[PDB]
C-alpha cells in the first residue's frame, strides 16, 4: 500500500510503427494448367483458404496513406517478378537495319490512312554465311525516318536494344496476397468515411491483405475495388495544384474495347535457335481499334463526382472538365493492356463538360503500340509479338486520377484535367487501409510484491 515495487511482464499487447519485408501468398490452383504467367505463382508459398480477422476494440489508430512504406516494397516486388520471365527468350540485337518501307493500301479506310508500313529488310540466317530478304508490317509509331520507298529505322535501337517478350507467356493479372512475418502485425481500418489520413476509431488485425491485382493502367483505374457509401476524394494536400486528386467510384462503369483486324503472324529464324515473330498480311478490310462506354451511366457518375467535389472549392464555383494536351502518348491517353496488345485510347469525349451551381454510346478511337518501355527505366525496352485473331475485352472503370489547373488566383472557374504519370499512385489506391506494426512485449508496472529471499 504505502510502498510499491517494480514488476516485469513479458508478452504485453503494445506495438510501435516500423517497417519490414512482407512476403507473398497466392492461391494454389495446383499450378497445372497455368501457361507460365509472368506474375508466376510458383515463386511464393500458397495461402490459407480460411482467413482470420480479429476485431480490436476501444482502440483508435492514426493512418497516413501518403507516407506508406508498403507501396515501395510492392513496386520493387512487382518489378523484380517481371524481370525474371523475360530473361530466357530471344534478344533482338540483329534487328538494327535500314528498313525500306512503303505505304499499304489494300482496301484501307480513310481513318487508318498510313499508320501501317510494308517494310522489307535484310537478315542473317542460322548459318552466319548467308542473308535472307524478309518483310513485315510495322505500325507507324515504331519507325522513325533516317537520312532526311525512303529509308526508315526502328525507334528504340539508337539508345538500347530490345528483348522480345516470350510468346507462350500471358500478361493477365492474378490476385496476390501480402503477408507479414512473425513478430509483426497488419492493421486494417474498417471505416467508411475514412479519407486516407488521420485517426481511425475502429481498427482490426488481419492475417494478411486481400487479393491485389497488379493491373497497370493510366488516367482511368480499371478492374479495381470500389468504396461503399459514396465516392471518396483523397489527396495529400488539396489546396496546391501540384498533387493528384485521386477519386474512387461507388458503382462501376462498364467499358468494352476491341481490335477487329484479323492478324496473322509469321516466324523467321535469326540464329541458332532464335526466332522472330513478325506480322504478315491482314485478311479483309482494315479498321481501327476502338472502345465503347455508355452515356447515361458516365454522365450520372460525373454528376456524383461533381456533387462530392464541391465540399472543398465552395458551393458557387463552376466546375469545368477539360482534356489533356501535349505529347508523350503514354501519359496523355488511356493506356490499358487488353489481351496482350498495348492500346492507347483518345479520352477526349468523356472529359468535356461544364457544371454550374444552378441507348447511345461514347466511342473512343485507339492506337496500338509494339515497342514499349514499362516499369519506366533507362536502357531497357520490350517487343510484344503480334496476336492473331480479333481481340475483345470488357472492363470496369472504378476510379479516376484528376489534376487541378490553377493559376486563376482570384476567380471561380476551377478546371480539372485528367493525368496519369507515375505508377505508384496506381497501387496507393488499394493499400490505403493497411499498416505494419512491430510488437514490443516487455513491460514494467508497480505493484505490491517482493521477491522473497
Amino acid at each position, epitope marked *: 500500500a504505502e510502498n510499491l515495487w517494480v514488476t516485469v511482464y513479458y508478452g504485453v499487447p503494445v506495438w510501435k510503427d516500423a517497417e519490414t519485408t512482407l512476403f507473398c501468398a497466392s492461391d494454389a490452383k495446383a499450378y497445372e494448367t497455368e501457361k507460365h504467367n509472368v506474375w508466376a505463382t510458383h515463386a511464393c508459398v500458397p495461402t490459407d483458404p480460411n482467413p482470420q480477422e480479429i476485431h480490436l476494440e476501444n482502440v483508435t489508430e492514426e493512418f497516413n496513406m501518403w507516407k506508406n512504406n508498403m507501396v515501395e516494397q510492392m513496386h520493387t516486388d512487382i518489378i523484380s517478378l517481371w524481370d525474371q520471365s523475360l530473361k530466357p527468350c530471344v534478344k533482338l540485337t540483329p534487328l538494327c537495319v535500314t528498313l525500306q518501307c512503303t505505304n499499304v493500301t489494300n482496301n484501307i479506310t480513310d481513318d487508318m490512312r498510313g499508320e501501317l508500313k510494308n517494310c522489307s529488310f535484310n537478315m542473317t540466317t542460322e548459318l552466319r554465311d548467308k542473308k535472307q530478304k524478309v518483310y513485315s508490317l510495322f505500325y507507324r509509331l515504331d519507325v522513325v525516318q533516317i537520312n532526311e520507298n525512303k529509308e526508315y529505322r526502328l525507334i528504340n535501337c*539508337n539508345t538500347s536494344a530490345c528483348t522480345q517478350a516470350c510468346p507462350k507467356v500471358s500478361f493477365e493479372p492474378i490476385p496476390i496476397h501480402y503477408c507479414a512475418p512473425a513478430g509483426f502485425a497488419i492493421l486494417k481500418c474498417k471505416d467508411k468515411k475514412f479519407n486516407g489520413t488521420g485517426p481511425c476509431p475502429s481498427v482490426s488485425t488481419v492475417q494478411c491483405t486481400h487479393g491485389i491485382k497488379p493491373v497497370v493502367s493510366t488516367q482511368l483505374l480499371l478492374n479495381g475495388s470500389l468504396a461503399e457509401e459514396e465516392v471518396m476524394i483523397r489527396s495529400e494536400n488539396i489546396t496546391n495544384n501540384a498533387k493528384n486528386i485521386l477519386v474512387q467510384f461507388n458503382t462501376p462503369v462498364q467499358i468494352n474495347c476491341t481490335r477487329p483486324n484479323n492478324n496473322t503472324r509469321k516466324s523467321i529464324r535469326i540464329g541458332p535457335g532464335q526466332a522472330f515473330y513478325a506480322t504478315g498480311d491482314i485478311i479483309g478490310d482494315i479498321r481501327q481499334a476502338h472502345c465503347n462506354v455508355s452515356k447515361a451511366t458516365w454522365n450520372e457518375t460525373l454528376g456524383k463526382v461533381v456533387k462530392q467535389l464541391r465540399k472543398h472549392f465552395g458551393n458557387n464555383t463552376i466546375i469545368r472538365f477539360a482534356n489533356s*494536351s501535349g*505529347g*508523350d502518348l503514354e501519359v496523355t491517353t488511356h493506356s490499358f493492356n487488353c489481351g496482350g496488345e498495348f492500346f492507347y485510347c483518345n479520352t477526349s469525349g468523356l472529359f468535356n463538360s461544364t457544371w454550374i451551381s444552378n441507348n447511345d454510346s461514347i466511342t473512343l478511337p485507339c492506337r496500338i503500340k509494339q515497342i514499349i*518501355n514499362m516499369w519506366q527505366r533507362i536502357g531497357q525496352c520490350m517487343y510484344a509479338p503480334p496476336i492473331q485473331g480479333v481481340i475483345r475485352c470488357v472492363s470496369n472503370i472504378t476510379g479516376l486520377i484528376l489534376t487541378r489547373d490553377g493559376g486563376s488566383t482570384n476567380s471561380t472557374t476551377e478546371t480539372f484535367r485528367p493525368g496519369g*504519370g507515375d505508377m505508384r499512385d496506381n497501387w496507393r489506391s488499394e493499400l490505403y487501409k493497411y499498416k505494419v506494426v512491430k510488437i514490443e512485449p516487455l513491460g514494467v508496472a508497480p505493484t505490491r510484491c517482493k521477491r522473497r529471499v
Partner: nanobody, 125 residues
Framework: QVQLQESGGGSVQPGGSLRLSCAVS????????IGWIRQAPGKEREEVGC????????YYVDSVKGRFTISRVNEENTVYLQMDNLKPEDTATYYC??????????????????RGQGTQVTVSS
C-alpha cells in the same frame, strides 16, 4: 539537391540565331524530362517545349515549330535550346524546369518543383 543554372541570352536584332544552355547538378539527364518555359512581361507563364526521357523524343507547342530545337548532352549533363529566326514576340524570360519524372506533358511544365533563375532575351527594332 537539384540545381539548374542557365547561361546565354541577351539582346539580338530581329532575325538571327541564339543558343541558351541549362546545366543540371544533382541529377543525370538521361531518365528525367527537361522543359523550357518562358514568361513574357504582363502575362502568366506560358511554355515553349520539352525533351523527354522516352527514346529522346522532343515536343514543342504549336506556336513554335520548325524554329526551336532542344538537344541534350549526357556526358556533360547539359541541355541546349537553339532558337532560329527570332521574332518580336519572343522577348521574354526563359527558365529550364524539371520534375524528376520519366515522361512529359505539355500542360504541367509551368507548375514544377525545381526551377532555375532564368535568362533574359530581348529583340527590338
Amino acid at each position: 539537391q537539384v540545381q539548374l543554372q542557365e547561361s546565354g541570352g541577351g539582346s539580338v536584332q530581329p532575325g538571327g540565331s541564339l543558343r541558351l544552355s541549362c546545366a543540371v547538378s544533382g541529377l543525370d539527364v538521361e531518365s528525367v524530362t527537361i522543359g523550357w518555359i518562358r514568361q513574357a512581361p504582363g502575362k502568366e507563364r506560358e511554355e515553349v517545349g520539352c525533351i523527354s526521357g522516352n527514346f529522346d523524343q522532343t515536343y514543342y507547342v504549336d506556336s513554335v515549330k520548325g524554329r526551336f530545337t532542344i538537344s541534350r548532352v549526357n556526358e556533360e549533363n547539359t541541355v541546349y535550346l537553339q532558337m532560329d529566326n527570332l521574332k518580336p514576340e519572343d522577348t521574354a524570360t526563359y527558365y529550364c524546369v524539371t520534375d524528376r519524372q520519366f515522361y512529359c506533358a505539355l500542360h504541367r511544365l509551368p507548375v514544377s518543383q525545381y526551377r532555375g533563375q532564368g535568362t533574359q532575351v530581348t529583340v527590338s527594332s
